[PDB]
């Protein structure tokens, strides 16, 4: 150790190089690297000097590597590296003649930027995004693609989100990168895109205009949950936008894909997200709702609303209820023919107060259609009221006149007064 600190501070390149390699090796260990202990040895500022030794690309590389391993540590370890001015240097190193140095500068910058939004915004401020995207072309080796994408994803990560104007140029690169077959690149790219599509519809506008939609729908069927999860997030974000933005996704047969996500034995978290995604499509027009009906999603949807875990039931209710909101008279009768009345009634006693309002709202839209059929047939009774009554739904609503919440209170009264006088 005292020979390490010394050679680092020496004038001899041999001494300098061995010591840095040793420190690097010291910091390169897998189980609890001695990061606190390499900083308090006072070589960190000397490591930052070695980064500028363009004549000694090996020392640069080794120094950048030890600095990277230091910045993988605690928030403080990262704040020390920043304070010694390494951020602009690593960005300058992205223009290195050496490929090992450029790849390491990327990994370093990803580590600093991964620390916090604060650190992310400084790395972006030192102009790291533009020299980063220039390292990506038709000849970029896989190791660098993994490094660069993981870094690009971290530049985008974080709450509050970075300016969209700052992260926008990275969109063309990410749009290419999702065409890779490498799981790691596909993983980080989709996470990166899931961050950029999260926000206002003009952000979603930028994302679909970059042309990612077809490939994203394919990644729904990726065998790895590591790729499916961020891809499902992105696709879900896109369909929270308008009808036309939602259409870019529907156009590439995503509904049959989402259908299979609910049917195969997958994690609750995944099934829950496909349903939230499905809910934002039945939150669309009569034809987007028709696109869902056509794929055969209602059938399985109802089954989930009836028998699935409550984190899934919550989202299946929203899908079903939203469909009654924008749907036609006939589509709505199809939802009832698939047997959605009973599963909607059963949730009027769930402890989640928002859900109860959603089912109640969905049940009322069913009631209005049944009311129109009662007039068209000049009948005595609303057929759908009889079904709601049959599902023990009439008694639940009668009891919701006892609810503590005014939103729920006023709607139960409204429903009973409009359909049960």
């Amino acid at each position: 150790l005292p020979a390490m600190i010394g050679g680092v501070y020496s004038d001899d390149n041999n001494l300098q190089l061995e010591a840095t390699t040793q420190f690097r090796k010291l910091l390169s260990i897998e189980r609890s690297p001695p990061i606190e202990e390499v900083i308090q040895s006072g070589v960190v500022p000397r490591f930052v000097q070695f980064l500028t030794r363009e004549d000694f690309p090996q020392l640069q590389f080794e120094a950048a590597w030890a600095l990277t391993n230091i910045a993988s540590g605690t928030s403080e370890n990262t704040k020390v590296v920043i304070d010694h001015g390494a951020v602009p240097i690593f960005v300058k190193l992205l223009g290195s003649s050496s490929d090992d140095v450029r790849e390491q500068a990327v990994w370093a910058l990803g580590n600093v930027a991964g620390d916090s939004p604060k650190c992310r915004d400084l790395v972006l401020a030192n102009g790291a995004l533009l020299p980063l995207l220039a390292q990506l072309n038709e000849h970029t080796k896989l190791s660098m693609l993994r490094n660069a994408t993981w870094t690009l994803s971290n530049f985008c990560r974080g709450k509050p989100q970075p300016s969209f104007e700052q992260t926008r140029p990275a969109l063309p690169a990410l749009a290419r990168l999702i065409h890779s077959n490498d799981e790691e690149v596909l993983t980080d790219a989709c996470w990166a895109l899931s961050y950029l599509s999260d926000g206002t519809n003009d952000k979603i506008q930028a994302v679909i205009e970059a042309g990612v939609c077809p490939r994203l729908v394919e990644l729904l069927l990726h065998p790895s949950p590591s790729v499916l999860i961020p891809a499902l997030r992105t696709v879900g974000n896109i369909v929270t936008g308008d009808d036309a933005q939602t259409q870019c996704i529907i156009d590439h047969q995503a509904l049959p894909c989402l259908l299979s996500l609910l049917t195969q034995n997958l994690k609750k978290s995944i099934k829950k997200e496909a349903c939230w995604t499905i809910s934002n499509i039945t939150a669309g027009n009569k034809d987007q709702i028709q696109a869902v009906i056509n794929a055969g999603i209602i059938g399985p949807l109802v089954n989930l609303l009836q028998t699935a875990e409550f984190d899934i039931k919550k989202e299946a209710a929203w899908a079903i209820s939203n469909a009654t909101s924008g749907g036609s008279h006939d589509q709505i009768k199809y939802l009832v023919s698939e047997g959605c009345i009973k599963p909607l009634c059963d949730l009027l006693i769930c402890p989640d107060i928002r859900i109860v309002t959603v089912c109640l709202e969905g049940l009322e839209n069913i009631l209005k259609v049944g009311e129109t059929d009662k007039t068209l047939a000049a009948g005595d009774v609303n057929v759908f009221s009889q079904m709601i009554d049959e599902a023990e739904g009439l008694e639940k609503i009668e009891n919701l006149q006892s609810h503590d919440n005014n939103e729920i209170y006023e709607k139960a009264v409204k429903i009973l007064e409009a359909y049960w006088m």
């Binding site: 999260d198 936008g241 209820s321 939203n322 909101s325 928002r354 709202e361 969905g362």
Partner: peptide, 7 residues
């Protein structure tokens, strides 16, 4: 009023 799109 309750039903619609969700971010």
């Amino acid at each position: 009023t309750v039903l619609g799109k969700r971010k």
